Amino acid sequence: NFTQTLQKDANASSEFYINKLGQTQELEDQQTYKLLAARVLIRENKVEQSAALLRELGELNDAQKLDRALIEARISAAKNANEVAQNQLRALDLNKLSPSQKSRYYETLAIVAENRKDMIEAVKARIEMDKNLTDVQRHQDNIDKTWALLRSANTGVINNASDEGNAALGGWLTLIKAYNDYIRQPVQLSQALQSWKNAYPNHAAATLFPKELLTL
Numbered sequence: 001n002f003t004q005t006l007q008k009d010a011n012a013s014s015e016f017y018i019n020k021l022g023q024t025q026e027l028e029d030q031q032t033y034k035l036l037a038a039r040v041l042i043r044e045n046k047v048e049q050s051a052a053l054l055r056e057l058g059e060l061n062d063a064q065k066l067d068r069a070l071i072e073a074r075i076s077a078a079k080n081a082n083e084v085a086q087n088q089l090r091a092l093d094l095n096k097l098s099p100s101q102k103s104r105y106y107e108t109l110a111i112v113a114e115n116r117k118d119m120i121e122a123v124k125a126r127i128e129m130d131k132n133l134t135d136v137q138r139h140q141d142n143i144d145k146t147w148a149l150l151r152s153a154n155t156g157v158i159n160n161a162s163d164e165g166n167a168a169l170g171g172w173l174t175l176i177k178a179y180n181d182y183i184r185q186p187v188q189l190s191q192a193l194q195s196w197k198n199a200y201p202n203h204a205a206a207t208l209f210p211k212e213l214l215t216l
Contacts, residue, residue, distance in 0.1 A: 007098035102132040147210035150176040171203040
């Protein structure tokens with residue numbers, strides 16, 4: 001089943017998928033290539049082209065409808081239609097999504113939260129996203145995006161935030177606190193960071209440290 005390709009990461013470019021269109025005979029597969037192309041068009045910062053490609057889809061099977069719904073939600077998040085994006089995600093059955101599709105689902109939730117400037121809700125979504133990722137580069141990107149969210153938050157927001165029993169969230173909050181405490185004290189910061197790693201040795205950020213914190 002070529003349709004199962006949707007359940008995996010799309011590593012090629014939109015030009016690749018779009019070029020495969022005028023080279024395939026089957027209608028079913030034509031729709032799959034369109035969907036793959038639409039997913040990546042967002043990556044290429046081409047939201048309108050993505051939306052345009054969805055609108056010229058033909059007949060779709062159940063699996064193809066599932067991936068269309070995911071892309072639609074991501075387009076809505078990109079246009080800051082936050083309640084729309086939110087309900088498009090909620091209209092989906094999370095149990096039917098592959099791991100890659102779940103990561104796209106939570107990424108969209110994170111973008112919505114960030115649009116609404118709820119940094120902690122965005123971090124929580126990205127914690128869920130990270131549980132469904134498998135590619136190192138995608139792991140690193142989400143770690144760096146999660147760290148940027150924490151960096152964007154007021155020291156007040158960070159200090160008042162509870163982890164809610166969320167161990168991952170607890171680790172993240174401890175890390176940004178350490179950074180904020182010792183920002184302009186290189187030697188002490190360096191040791192605070194290593195001490196955090198020793199205390200949270202199996203945290204996502206312990207294995208792949210944020211790029212900003214490695215630079216230090």
